[PDB]
Design a binder for this molecule. Structure first.
Ligand SMILES: CC(=O)N[C@@H](Cc1ccc(C(C(=O)O)C(=O)O)c(C(=O)O)c1)C(=O)N[C@H]1CCCCN(Cc2ccc(-c3ccccc3)cc2)C1=O
Length: 106
């Protein structure tokens, strides 16, 4: 269960995820997974980033889940679970702003 994961914030809004991720103490890759605000069945991976150009900022990546069982950000790279997906992105930046590092503080 996703509801078991400490990085799963469930039904929080996009604005709220930005409020939590825009904390000065968050290093790049601080993240949380929440429900998509407008796509039934989808989730969103909200991630903190930082560069001199934009300072501290947030990126939101939609996560799709097929009834066929696969979870993914890009259909080319699928996982059997949301947990496996988070594990993979904690080791690979790929198309993300930074590899996932630590769960977002509230
Ligand atoms: C309004 C907004 O924040 N849009 C997000 C997408 C998005 C997320 C959540 C909701 C949203 C919510 O906020 O709840 C909702 O679902 O309703 C909505 C929305 O408003 O509809 C839309 C966006 O454009 N993110 C960027 C994020 C930065 C990269 C650029 N890109 C395209 C992309 C390219 C590559 C990859 C990639 C990643 C890993 C590996 C390989 C490739 C992923 C995305 C994105 O999707």
């Amino acid at each position: 269960s996703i509801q078991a994961e400490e990085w799963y914030f469930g039904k929080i809004t996009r604005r709220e995820s930005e409020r939590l991720l825009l904390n000065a103490e968050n290093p790049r890759g601080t993240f949380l997974v929440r429900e998509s605000e407008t796509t039934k069945g989808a989730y969103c991976l909200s991630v903190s980033d930082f560069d001199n150009a934009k300072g501290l900022n947030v990126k939101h990546y939609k996560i799709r889940k097929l009834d066929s069982g696969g979870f993914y950000i890009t259909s080319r790279t699928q996982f059997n679970s949301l947990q496996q997906l988070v594990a993979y992105y904690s080791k690979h930046a790929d198309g993300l702003c930074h590899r996932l590092t630590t769960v977002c503080p509230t």
